[PDB]
Design a protein around this ligand. Structure first.
Ligand SMILES: [Mg+2]
Ligand SMILES: [Mg+2]
Ligand SMILES: [Mg+2]
Ligand SMILES: [Mg+2]
Length: 210
DNA sequence: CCCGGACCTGTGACAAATTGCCCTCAGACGG
DNA sequence: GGCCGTCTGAGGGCAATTTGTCACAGGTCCG
């Protein structure tokens, strides 16, 4: 199945995208790398890749696409729009998109790589972001260990404001996304909290391959 | 001493958003 | 040649679940 690779600058960029948007983004990065910024998506191919009906695929592509307008990307800083022209459909079942050509060098560069089947069952987009960031540190054999700072997680992934209260961070983000990864990818994940005084400052992740 | 206060934790509630499902009907194609 | 039966996909919706938000109970230490 398709092998996604991407610059670490993208893995660690600041942005807010939905699951459906992130799914399309993997294919854009795949199309671009296999070579101006103009990409294409076929309804019927998307449905087969992610096990959807054509109808629900159509709904997913269409709504995702109009929600890109005005979205911006920050590399730590510098801000860019993803798209510089609205999407449009020349043929039935076919969509054409114009990626910001200044983003090309950030896609292809100190890199991250994973097969697309590893992530296609994840639902929560924050769990996608987390699985990408861990892959950046994985070893050939399939294991790794890394410490991420809590303020940096909040900025980079653009978590919502109430997760600045630590019990909500644990309950609605950390625990859920560790569960999905353990339930939906071939990885087995554990963690421990690093504290300084009363505040929790980093999260330390360990993982192996099944 | 023990207070009110400033931190921290977890949980119960509710509001807002997203999920996989369902139904309709016209477009593009073929037998 | 052209009608109609089928495969697509662009729309309209849903209830059951998940995600986002905040009040309140209940721990500690400070001055
Ligand atoms: Mg959908
Ligand atoms: Mg008393
Ligand atoms: Mg009690
Ligand atoms: Mg008290």
């Amino acid at each position: 199945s398709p092998r996604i690779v991407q610059s670490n600058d993208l893995t660690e960029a600041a942005y807010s995208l939905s699951r459906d948007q992130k799914r399309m983004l993997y294919l854009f990065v795949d199309q671009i790398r296999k070579s101006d910024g103009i990409c294409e998506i076929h309804v019927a191919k998307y449905a087969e890749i992610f096990g959807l009906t054509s109808a629900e695929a159509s709904k997913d592509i269409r709504q995702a696409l109009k929600s890109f307008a005005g979205k911006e990307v920050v590399f730590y800083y510098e801000s860019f729009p993803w798209f510089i022209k609205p999407a449009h459909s020349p043929s039935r079942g076919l969509y054409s998109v114009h990626i910001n050509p200044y983003l090309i060098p950030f896609f292809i560069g100190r890199f991250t790589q994973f097969r697309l089947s590893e992530t296609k069952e994840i639902t929560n987009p924050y769990a996608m972001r987390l699985y990408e960031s861990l892959c950046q540190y994985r070893k050939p054999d399939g294991s790794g260990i890394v410490s991420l700072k809590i303020d940096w997680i909040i900025e980079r992934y653009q978590l919502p404001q109430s997760y600045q209260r630590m019990p909500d961070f644990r309950r609605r983000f950390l625990q859920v996304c560790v569960n999905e990864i353990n339930s939906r990818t071939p990885m087995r994940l554990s963690y421990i909290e690093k504290k300084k005084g009363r505040q929790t400052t980093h999260i330390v992740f360990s993982f192996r391959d099944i």
